[PDB]
Amino acid sequence: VLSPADKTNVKAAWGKVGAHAGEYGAEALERMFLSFPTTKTYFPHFDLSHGSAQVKGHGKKVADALTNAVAHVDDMPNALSALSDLHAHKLRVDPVNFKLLSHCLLVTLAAHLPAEFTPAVHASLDKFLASVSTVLTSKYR
Amino acid sequence: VLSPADKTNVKAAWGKVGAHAGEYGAEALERMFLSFPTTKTYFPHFDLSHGSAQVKGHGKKVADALTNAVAHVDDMPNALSALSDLHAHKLRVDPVNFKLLSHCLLVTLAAHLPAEFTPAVHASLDKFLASVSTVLTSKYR
Amino acid sequence: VHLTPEEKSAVTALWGKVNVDEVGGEALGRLLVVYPWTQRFFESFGDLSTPDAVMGNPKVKAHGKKVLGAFSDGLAHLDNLKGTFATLSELHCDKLHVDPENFRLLGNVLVCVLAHHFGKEFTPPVQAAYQKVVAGVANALAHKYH
Amino acid sequence: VHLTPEEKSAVTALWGKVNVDEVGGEALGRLLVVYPWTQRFFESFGDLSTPDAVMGNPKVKAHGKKVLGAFSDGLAHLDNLKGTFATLSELHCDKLHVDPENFRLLGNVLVCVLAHHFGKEFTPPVQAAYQKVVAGVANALAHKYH
Numbered sequence: 156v157l158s159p160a161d162k163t164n165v166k167a168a169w170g171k172v173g174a175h176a177g178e179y180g181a182e183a184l185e186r187m188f189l190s191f192p193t194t195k196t197y198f199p200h201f202d203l204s205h206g207s208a209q210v211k212g213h214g215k216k217v218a219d220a221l222t223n224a225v226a227h228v229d230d231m232p233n234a235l236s237a238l239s240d241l242h243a244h245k246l247r248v249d250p251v252n253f254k255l256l257s258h259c260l261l262v263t264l265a266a267h268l269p270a271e272f273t274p275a276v277h278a279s280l281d282k283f284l285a286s287v288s289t290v291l292t293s294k295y296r
Numbered sequence: 297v298l299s300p301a302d303k304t305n306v307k308a309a310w311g312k313v314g315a316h317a318g319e320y321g322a323e324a325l326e327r328m329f330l331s332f333p334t335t336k337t338y339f340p341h342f343d344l345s346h347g348s349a350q351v352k353g354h355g356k357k358v359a360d361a362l363t364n365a366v367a368h369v370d371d372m373p374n375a376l377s378a379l380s381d382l383h384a385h386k387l388r389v390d391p392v393n394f395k396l397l398s399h400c401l402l403v404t405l406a407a408h409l410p411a412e413f414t415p416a417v418h419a420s421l422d423k424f425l426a427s428v429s430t431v432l433t434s435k436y437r
Numbered sequence: 438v439h440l441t442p443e444e445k446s447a448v449t450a451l452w453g454k455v456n457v458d459e460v461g462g463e464a465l466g467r468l469l470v471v472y473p474w475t476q477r478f479f480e481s482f483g484d485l486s487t488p489d490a491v492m493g494n495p496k497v498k499a500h501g502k503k504v505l506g507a508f509s510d511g512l513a514h515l516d517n518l519k520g521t522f523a524t525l526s527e528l529h530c531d532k533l534h535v536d537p538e539n540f541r542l543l544g545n546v547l548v549c550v551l552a553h554h555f556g557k558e559f560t561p562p563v564q565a566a567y568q569k570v571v572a573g574v575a576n577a578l579a580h581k582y583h
Numbered sequence: 584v585h586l587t588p589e590e591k592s593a594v595t596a597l598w599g600k601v602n603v604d605e606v607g608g609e610a611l612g613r614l615l616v617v618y619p620w621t622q623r624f625f626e627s628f629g630d631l632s633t634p635d636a637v638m639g640n641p642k643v644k645a646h647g648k649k650v651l652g653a654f655s656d657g658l659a660h661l662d663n664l665k666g667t668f669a670t671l672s673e674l675h676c677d678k679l680h681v682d683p684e685n686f687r688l689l690g691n692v693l694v695c696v697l698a699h700h701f702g703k704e705f706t707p708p709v710q711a712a713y714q715k716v717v718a719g720v721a722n723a724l725a726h727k728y729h
């Protein structure tokens with residue numbers, strides 16, 4: 156579960172992201188593609204080159220979904236309902252990849268939040284991304 | 297997560313197991329120790345040889361916990377609460393290991409249920425064990 | 438390498454009894470039932486709407502036979518799994534875009550099928566041998582991914 | 584999984600800026616905070632009651648120094664990680680009973696620390712390089728388990 160303190164920590168750190176959410180989503184995706192090349196199997200239809208509009212666009216969508224989740228942290232299943240349907244019924248991304256994307260989001264956050272990425276905040280962020288991943292895979296079977 | 301059909305399938309299969317639950321529990325632990333030698337790191341105080349009374353005693357406990365789960369399938373977090381505490385707080389088994397034991401429980405059931413272990417029942421049992429695993433790791437952080 | 442003498446002998450002895458066509462169809466069908474998101478690779482295979490439909494699907498059965506046939510061939514080359522599957526590895530990466538995690542899921546299911554089909558003869562030691570195999574084959578098939 | 588020559592150079596260049604004692608102590612403290620079940624090995628270390636208590640604990644710090652010191656020395660042997668870590672692998676399995684998953688968790692935490700410490704210098708390709716290294720070390724340390 157996300158504790159009330161987790162929720163405080165996430166809201167604080169994500170507020171800080173603010174207007175960079177899109178740039179940070181794209182950087183996380185690139186970190187994923189480069190560090191974990193098997194994740195590219197889900198994007199064979201994409202221009203994955205550095206700075207591509209497709210990566211930047213997908214980065215923003217991912218960022219905005221995360222913002223939505225932070226905003227409705229107390230009821231992420233309802234808030235992410237359409238997105239959970241989409242991953243479960245259409246995209247069908249193997250659940251293992253969520254941990255890889257989550258790790259890459261966390262690394263992006265650490266690289267951009269020197270002031271805010273304390274051990275406690277690190278833990279909360281990790282839990283939060285795990286929770287989001289659970290919600291997004293909840294309807295797979 | 298678990299559908300009416302999943303619950304029905306789980307109860308039917310575990311019903312057929314019956315009084316052999318303990319035996320199958322011990323067999324599943326044995327399968328785990330041999331197949332995934334890293335899981336033995338949790339049992340340095342055990343004689344893990346085939347037929348070990350320690351493995352049989354632990355197999356019965358694991359089996360009985362699963363029986364309790366099955367009997368409280370709509371209220372599993374509370375049924376398993378003391379076990380969640382124990383794994384989260386004291387034993388501190390890395391979460392990755394629950395999928396290994398779940399697989400070996402699945403294999404044991406398969407080796408013993410020629411009629412019951414249909415594709416559908418296999419799918420429900422896998423879900424059921426994943427749910428138990430989730431509950432048992434739910435208090436880890 | 439990774440398998441012991443007792444393990445290689447256990448693998449070969451059990452595989453003597455395996456109808457590779459049947460077991461292949463059963464394993465592939467079960468993959469698609471137990472982890473239904475794996476159906477994403479089989480859009481053109483027809484009716485996959487229920488477990489009975491998946492298992493009875495001739496395209497599933499046909500492809501299952503092909504998959505396990507290649508697996509079976511690899512068992513003759515246990516010390517060279519990477520070399521043996523390199524060509525199929527590149528295919529799965531470059532043309533089929535198959536997440537290698539699927540190979541691990543297929544291993545799980547194959548082990549469950551063998552347990553279900555052979556019962557008691559699928560002993561904890563025989564299973565441990567098969568687990569080394571399926572890990573080996575999945576690693577070999579994933580090896581040329583980039 | 585191999586490192587390219589440019590990847591090796593990038594890893595060496597970054598590591599030359601690392602304060603190993605400091606990064607060690609912080610990586611280990613973060614492991615124990617973010618994945619608190621890893622505390623199971625450290626009941627003799629005293630106060631781990633809070634995130635600040637774990638980070639400030641001199642026994643945690645000392646152990647981080649020890650672990651990252653060995654890691655650091657291992658970076659001179661990227662071509663022979665299994666050989667270089669074999670005896671440590673035996674010890675962690677036979678005497679310490681450390682589940683090798685703990686190595687992968689520590690690798691994750693290490694990557695987060697390097698990213699926090701170095702900011703934008705810890706670029707996507709530099710991370711990719713480090714992700715090969717931490718994978719390699721974890722594999723090397725798990726290699727003699729039985």
Ligand code: HEM
Pocket residue numbers: 194197198213216217220221238241242246248252253254256257287288291
């Ligand atoms: C934190 C976890 C994730 C979040 C919040 C997320 C969110 C999203 C969103 C908002 C979209 C666009 C949906 C729309 O257009 O309405 C999407 C699509 C997609 N995602 Fe996920 N996702 C996550 C994990 C993953 C992972 C791990 C992968 C594969 C490694 C993946 C692969 C895809 C693909 C292939 C699409 C379709 C892209 C396109 O064709 O435009 N996702 N995701």
Ligand code: HEM
Pocket residue numbers: 335338339354357358361362379382383387389393394395397398428429432
């Ligand atoms: C299906 C999942 C599991 C269930 C239902 C389960 C259940 C149990 C139960 C009922 C006990 C006995 C508690 C008591 O009454 O004293 C126990 C203890 C224990 N379990 Fe778990 N467990 C599971 C997963 C695991 C895994 C994956 C591991 C490690 C590979 C593990 C390691 C242990 C250990 C080391 C003990 C203490 C054994 C002793 O010292 O007697 N468990 N578990």
Ligand code: HEM
Pocket residue numbers: 475478479500503504505507508525529533535539540543574578
């Ligand atoms: C034991 C592991 C595997 C082996 C040895 C293997 C081998 C093969 C072979 C030999 C073919 C071509 C068959 C032909 O001659 O027509 C093939 C095709 C294919 N495989 Fe794999 N395979 C394995 C696992 C998997 C898994 C787990 C999946 C997806 C869940 C997958 C997805 C596919 C797809 C989509 C094709 C193309 C099928 C089509 O024609 O539409 N494979 N594989």
Ligand code: HEM
Pocket residue numbers: 621624625649650651653654671674675679681685686689720724
């Ligand atoms: C980069 C990966 C790691 C390296 C290079 C490493 C290396 C070392 C070394 C050099 C020692 C001292 C051995 C001796 O006394 O000769 C040691 C001991 C030890 N390590 Fe590891 N280690 C790693 C990861 C871990 C992790 C992740 C854990 C647990 C979460 C762990 C738990 C222990 C414990 C409990 C000891 C005994 C220390 C004592 O008795 O004070 N290690 N390790």
Ligand SMILES: [Xe]
Pocket residue numbers: 176179180183218221260
């Ligand atoms: Xe983000």
Ligand SMILES: [Xe]
Pocket residue numbers: 198201209210213
């Ligand atoms: Xe993308």
Ligand SMILES: [Xe]
Pocket residue numbers: 165169221225283
């Ligand atoms: Xe976030």
Ligand SMILES: [Xe]
Pocket residue numbers: 306310362366421424
């Ligand atoms: Xe069960």
Ligand SMILES: [Xe]
Pocket residue numbers: 320321324401404405
């Ligand atoms: Xe079982």
Ligand SMILES: [Xe]
Pocket residue numbers: 325339342350351354355
């Ligand atoms: Xe046991």
Ligand SMILES: [Xe]
Pocket residue numbers: 460461462464465501502504505
């Ligand atoms: Xe198959």
Ligand SMILES: [Xe]
Pocket residue numbers: 540541543544547571574575
């Ligand atoms: Xe496999």
Ligand SMILES: [Xe]
Pocket residue numbers: 589590593708709712
């Ligand atoms: Xe690099």
Ligand SMILES: [Xe]
Pocket residue numbers: 686687689690717718720721
């Ligand atoms: Xe590591």
